Amino acid sequence: DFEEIPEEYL
Amino acid sequence: IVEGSDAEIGMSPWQVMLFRKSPQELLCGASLISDRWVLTAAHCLLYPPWDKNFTENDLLVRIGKHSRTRYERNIEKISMLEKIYIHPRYNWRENLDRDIALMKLKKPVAFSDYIHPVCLPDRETAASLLQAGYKGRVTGWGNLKEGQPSVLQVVNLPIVERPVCKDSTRIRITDNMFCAGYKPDEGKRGDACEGDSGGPFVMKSPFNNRWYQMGIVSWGEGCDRDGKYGFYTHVFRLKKWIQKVIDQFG
Amino acid sequence: ADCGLRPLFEKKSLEDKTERELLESYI
Numbered sequence A: 001d002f003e004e005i006p007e008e009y010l
Numbered sequence B: 001i002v003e004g005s006d007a008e009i010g011m012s013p014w015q016v017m018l019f020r021k022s023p024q025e026l027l028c029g030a031s032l033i034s035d036r037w038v039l040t041a042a043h044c045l046l047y048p049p050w051d052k053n054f055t056e057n058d059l060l061v062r063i064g065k066h067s068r069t070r071y072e073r074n075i076e077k078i079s080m081l082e083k084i085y086i087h088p089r090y091n092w093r094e095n096l097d098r099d100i101a102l103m104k105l106k107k108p109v110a111f112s113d114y115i116h117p118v119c120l121p122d123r124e125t126a127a128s129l130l131q132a133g134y135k136g137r138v139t140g141w142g143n144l145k146e147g148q149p150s151v152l153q154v155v156n157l158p159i160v161e162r163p164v165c166k167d168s169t170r171i172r173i174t175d176n177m178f179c180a181g182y183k184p185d186e187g188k189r190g191d192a193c194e195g196d197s198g199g200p201f202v203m204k205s206p207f208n209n210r211w212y213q214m215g216i217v218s219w220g221e222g223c224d225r226d227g228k229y230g231f232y233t234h235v236f237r238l239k240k241w242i243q244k245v246i247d248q249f250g
Numbered sequence C: 001a002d003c004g005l006r007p008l009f010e011k012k013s014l015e016d017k018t019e020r021e022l023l024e025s026y027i
């Protein structure tokens, strides 16, 4: 449902 | 938020989204109180009846948001948790008494037009503003009814007298809570709801024209039910704990 | 120190569309 976020934050 | 409206851009720049990393989803609301401290409800993080027990590495803080689901490039800021602090006498076993937790960020966040901390009340602002009939403002990305909004929702709601709060529920109410919401005969309606948890109840002081966070979205029986009211953690009542944490852990 | 003053509203002396409802309840 949510737009994926920049990998740096994961 | 049920029966609220879309927020204006920059209207609640202390609004924080607690975000679960895997699977990627909203966990709760929260609020920015300094460039590295975020305030929320303890039940967002710890609630053993539902097997909820989040660790720092389980979560991210997204600050500056408007859109619920979208990644807001060049506008939101996403921060990692250094440490969670939950009130030591938070009462998850019975009534969610002292439903409050702090989160310390790994790195300070940069303030912007969309990111800015809210104030916490002192005794005098609290005594002056927490009065039955006085309205505050609740914001969040939670359910639209007892469904999910495209953008931040806002609703203004009057504080309710303590006897009316008590008479509206079988749950035991404490001095660390207040309730808010319209009565059935007042016609208007609105309420926080699931997913709004941990978000702020704010009031704009007429003395210095600043926004203060008086409450934290904590619990309610259903959402926007006639004769029921939303219940909020009483931030001023727990400020000693807040200052202690912030003082000992900076 | 600057808490509670929003950049796009109080800092610019702009009001949001419903804050007057709160002011009017502070009786």
Ligand SMILES: CC[C@@H](N)C(=O)N1CCC[C@H]1C(=O)NCc1ccc(C(=N)N)cc1
Pocket (backbone or CB within 6 Å): B043, B047, B171, B191, B192, B193, B194, B195, B196, B197, B217, B218, B219, B220, B221, B222, B223, B224, B229, B230, B231
């Ligand atoms: C005691 C009532 C129960 N429905 C509840 O609210 N709980 C069970 C423990 C967690 C908490 C919750 O779900 N909080 C989220 C919530 C629910 C309702 C409202 C409202 N104002 N209607 C706000 C937050």
Ligand code: NA
Pocket (backbone or CB within 6 Å): B166, B167, B168, B169, B170, B171
């Ligand atoms: Na009762």
Ligand code: NA
Pocket (backbone or CB within 6 Å): B181, B182, B191, B224, B225, B226, B227, B228, B229
């Ligand atoms: Na109600």
